[PDB]
Amino acid sequence: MRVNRCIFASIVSFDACITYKSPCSPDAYHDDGWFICNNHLIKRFKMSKMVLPIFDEDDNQFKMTIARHLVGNKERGIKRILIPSATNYQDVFNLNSMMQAEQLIFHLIYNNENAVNTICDNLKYTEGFTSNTQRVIHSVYATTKSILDTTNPNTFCSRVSRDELRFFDVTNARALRGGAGDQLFNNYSGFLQNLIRRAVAPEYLQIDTEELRFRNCATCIIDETGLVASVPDGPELYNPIRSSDIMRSQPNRLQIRNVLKFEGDTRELDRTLSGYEEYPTYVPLFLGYQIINSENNFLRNDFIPRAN
Amino acid sequence: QMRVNRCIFASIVSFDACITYKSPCSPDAYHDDGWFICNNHLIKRFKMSKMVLPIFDEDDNQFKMTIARHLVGNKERGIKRILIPSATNYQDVFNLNSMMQAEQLIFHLIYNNENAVNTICDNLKYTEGFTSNTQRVIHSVYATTKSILDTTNPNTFCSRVSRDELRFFDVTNARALRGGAGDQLFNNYSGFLQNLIRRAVAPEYLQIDTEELRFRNCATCIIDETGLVASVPDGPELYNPIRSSDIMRSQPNRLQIRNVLKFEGDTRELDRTLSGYEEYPTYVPLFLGYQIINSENNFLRNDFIPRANP
Amino acid sequence: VNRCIFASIVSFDACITYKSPCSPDAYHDDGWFICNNHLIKRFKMSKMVLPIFDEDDNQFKMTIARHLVGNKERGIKRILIPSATNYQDVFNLNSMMQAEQLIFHLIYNNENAVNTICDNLKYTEGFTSNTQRVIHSVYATTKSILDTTNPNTFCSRVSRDELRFFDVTNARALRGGAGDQLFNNYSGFLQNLIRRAVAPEYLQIDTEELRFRNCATCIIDETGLVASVPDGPELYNPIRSSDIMRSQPNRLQIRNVLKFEGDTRELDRTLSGYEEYPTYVPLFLGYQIINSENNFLRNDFIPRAN
Amino acid sequence: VNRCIFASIVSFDACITYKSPCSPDAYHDDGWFICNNHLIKRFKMSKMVLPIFDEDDNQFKMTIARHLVGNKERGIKRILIPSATNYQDVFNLNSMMQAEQLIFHLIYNNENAVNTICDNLKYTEGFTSNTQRVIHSVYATTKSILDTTNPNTFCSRVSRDELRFFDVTNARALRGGAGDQLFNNYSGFLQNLIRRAVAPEYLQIDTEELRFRNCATCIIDETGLVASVPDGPELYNPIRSSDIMRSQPNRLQIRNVLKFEGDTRELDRTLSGYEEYPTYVPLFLGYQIINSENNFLRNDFIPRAN
Ligand SMILES: [Zn+2]
Ligand SMILES: [Zn+2]
Ligand SMILES: [Zn+2]
Ligand SMILES: [Zn+2]
């Protein structure tokens, strides 16, 4: 289809004198479970897309989605939040310093209709609203709402794949029961629920009477503040982030940044150890317990909303 | 140069004077990378693979350490999970009285079993062709194995030993420069096996002068009275799908019954939808312990030196 | 002739020869007896000249040094010139070859350690008819320089007109303080090096005060010549790179640099053709009196004794 | 385009014509709105750039000024930027033609003085011919520049990502002392000039303070911006002879200069090789805070308000 499925693809200048670009990277058109491109996922949710190739013992491999968070180990506070909750979202995000269209998209993502109406009224106060700004605002709102219904299981018809269950509190997942984490998860918007399911791979992957443990400890948490990149115990995971993923904005915003460096040649060591299969460090998002029922359609190509 | 085979199991040669034998050591056997075992022999005997763990900083510099992924299935239990058996249970874990001679001699030397290797000599001496080839080949195997072990044994005459590194496997008191039960068991090991554990098992924490770099938030191996084992200090074992094809066929005649796992259903369309994204490997690396680098150190040194604990 | 004190660093083993990296300033007959490269490497200071101008036409330059201590650094990492009772801790002499250790021991008058080095080198084979005369050359050169800067050496002409009080309270009263006592405790070469690196905050010449800075940037406490301000946080002193990277290339060290992000080139061009005010931290402390009749303008080092 | 506020300065009577000797930098959009020549002549300050370096590769420049007040000068001779109350006393407006007086009165918001100058010139029998147009042109240019630098002008951009609290102390976090209110009383152009000339002692970039000087070399008091250290004797500032503008060629000079008698060429040529540490007195005072969200590296000067 070559259709931009990224939710943030509708960003546009509400004023009809400046034309705005479309930095959504190639993956935006790759119709997958994600409804956001890797560039926007990096810039707004501090996550990078990846695939988890689970293998069986003989031939057959199947790949799930996963994300690695880009939170530095030395960060603290609101800087560790990957996906803020509705309460703290307006504080974690600097919505004031963003294009009005992106703010509208964010307000819709968290079901803050009051903010959307405030933006609409503010834009009405301006001149030129009736002719062009109204049309562009309506187009952005329509696209965003359409994506949200696509990812919201509670929409007319909207077939929902209730074959497989997902929890974020393993304390009672094997009992089919949930914790507080999955309650907070249910509080989330459908689009954000799907995004969390895509980004946060389940630490356990019970399939028909078969448990597959992928990690021995979760790397993310679901707390009141939202989906956070803090280990459940001990110092934060060393996550060295370079300027590649950064893709910083505001070329005139002077920002200080404490960055570590390794002093030493390391070239002879690199040459000596080269040729081995490198083990990637990163930090995948592992948390919870996913149950795949005996009867199910789990290799379904087209995305279907998953409701617990 | 790079024409000397550093793998300890390279010397394996049939003691009999007729049947030849060429050990299938991987090319990596020829690199002086601190490993004194090749990747294929590591897989065959210690059930581990050889990987490199690259650690980057925020700037344009990086450095690589060694790490290994064990090849123990989640369903395995008992003495099948043991990667590196201890000096006592090793003869019970390995089936030494099946892998003919030579390799058995190397294994006995690796665990400092003088009596067993002497018994091997006693049995071999009665052969008709002893003073012929047999004695030469046995002596050559012993010499090569002893040289390999001295290269790693820090308590060898004029054996330079690095001491800017401190490695622990107990963590609870590693911040206080003190190890524990796991470290005590580790010290009992042979020098070659101590180096092998240091190479294979990457530290959970890495503390350079003062900055602590945490690589994993939970150890994946353990050092218990039975040795270095691939059991987590938690509930069900990590799902490790053994690549059956990759693992050598060993004995074509021996009939082994293996209950393999099989995923069912078409998955090519899913791969097409998820083709292009960087794949996060599902291997199980060996993470455990705490490694400290003194402010004054020669960590980025090419030549291997035994890293004896202070 | 190389006058850097650290010019004699060699290898006591006969095969490997090591000509210590010395800046071209080593050969100058300036008051310094150390080169800029070695001053940076060991005492973490960079040499500069402070020019003082009259009103119409006459400029005379005094010496000065800027320290290279980051504001974030704390503790024993702030001392530039350690005192003789703590230097073996601040300096990691153990990892400093042997000739450099000998020079450092001589600088601080640690004859015991020098003799220990002597014994250690006598035990080894190939010392008598080889390493001997090499350790001797190192010791002879080091002692020659130290007695050159030591005012008490025999028939050593010593200047006495000019006075230097690192405690400014009673300097106008012709008297030092605790810092000045600690300064007197130092070795002659170290006293000269301090008097060179650390410019005086005040300059009383012909009874005329010429206060240069309004606050000292260093302090002479027990630990030594500390690069610490005696008020509030430390001075922002960014040091970029490529000064001591000669450090053992296999020594893996972590460094917490502080980078600025954003395009500065438009702002740079906006204000480019302006005289730039340097952002280094000079070593200002104390009081210096010229004492009317004197020979301050003499182009040859003479030991200065308070 | 001449941005200097004193650029207009045209003889009100159509007569012998002179152009103000504005320096080349008058044609730079550096945010000074004053040339170095006029800055020196009137506010006894010299322009300079303070480069702040990061640890790796980046450096951003910042404006600064060095005052030209001799240490011996006292009283109203030490004031660089007089307050709106004492300026008619500090400045000899009487001996400043008339266009300079007009500009200065506008700078200090003295519309009464402007009106009396205008009326005195109205009484001229040859007023409406040519003087009215030139007077109005000078007024228009001056008012336009002041509006450019006045944040309260109609729909005028005013950035508030950056906070400049003088007299630091309690002002560190977010406060502002008596000096801060005194500064607030100034005109927008004068506030911009002070903030351009007086670099901040501290610079907290959203978490990280960058102390640039131990003590302030200037102070904001009731008399105005003063070149006086709050620590005792004034800083030695050897203002040379030639660099001073020879405005009045007939005024009797009488100037007590300072001289350094003695040969100094040997020392100069002995130590010429070393990097020189400038002896100018910059203007350090206060505390500048940069918020996490900011446009500080953005050119196209915007008036900054507290
Ligand atoms: Zn996008
Ligand atoms: Zn091998
Ligand atoms: Zn030198
Ligand atoms: Zn001008």
Numbering used by the authors:
A (entry chain O): 13 to 320
B (entry chain J): 12 to 321
C (entry chain P), D (entry chain Q): 15 to 320
The authors write:
Here, we present a 3.2 Å-resolution electron cryomicroscopy (cryo-EM) structure of the AcMNPV VP39 protein and its assembly into helical nucleocapsids. In our reconstruction, individual VP39 subunits pack as dimers that assemble into 14 helical strands and together form the central cylindrical structure of the baculoviral nucleocapsid. After local alignment, we estimated the overall resolution of the four-dimer reconstruction to be approximately 3.2 Å. We find that the VP39 monomer comprises a distinct mixed alpha/beta fold, which includes a putative Zinc finger domain facing the inside of the nucleocapsid. The Coulomb potential map reveals strong signal in the vicinity of cysteine 18, cysteine 36, cysteine 49, and histidine 52, which are positioned for tetrahedral coordination of a metal ion. Based on the nature and distances of the donor residues, which occur most frequently in Zinc coordination groups, we placed a Zinc metal ion at the center of the coordination group. The ZF faces the luminal volume of the VP39 nucleocapsid assembly and is surrounded by positively charged residues, consistent with a role in binding viral DNA. The intra-dimer interface is stabilized by the 75-residue long lasso loop, parts of which protrude into the adjacent monomer of the repeat domain and wrap around its antenna domain. Using the PDBePISA tool, we identified four inter-dimer contacts, which are all primarily mediated by hydrogen bonding. Lateral contacts stabilizing adjacent units in the nucleocapsid (square symbol) are predicted to be the strongest inter-dimer interactions of the helical assembly (the theoretical total gain in solvation free energy upon interface formation is ΔGsol = −13.8 kcal/mol; obtained from analysis using PDBePISA and defined as the difference in total solvation energies of isolated and interfacing chains).
Baculoviruses are a family of arthropod-infecting, double-stranded DNA viruses. Baculoviruses are insect-infecting pathogens with wide applications as biological pesticides, in vitro protein production vehicles and gene therapy tools. Its cylindrical nucleocapsid, which encapsulates and protects the circular double-stranded viral DNA encoding proteins for viral replication and entry, is formed by the highly conserved major capsid protein VP39. The 39 kDa protein VP39 is the most abundant component of the nucleocapsid, with homologs in alpha- and betabaculoviruses. VP39 forms the capsid shell encasing the nucleocapsid core.
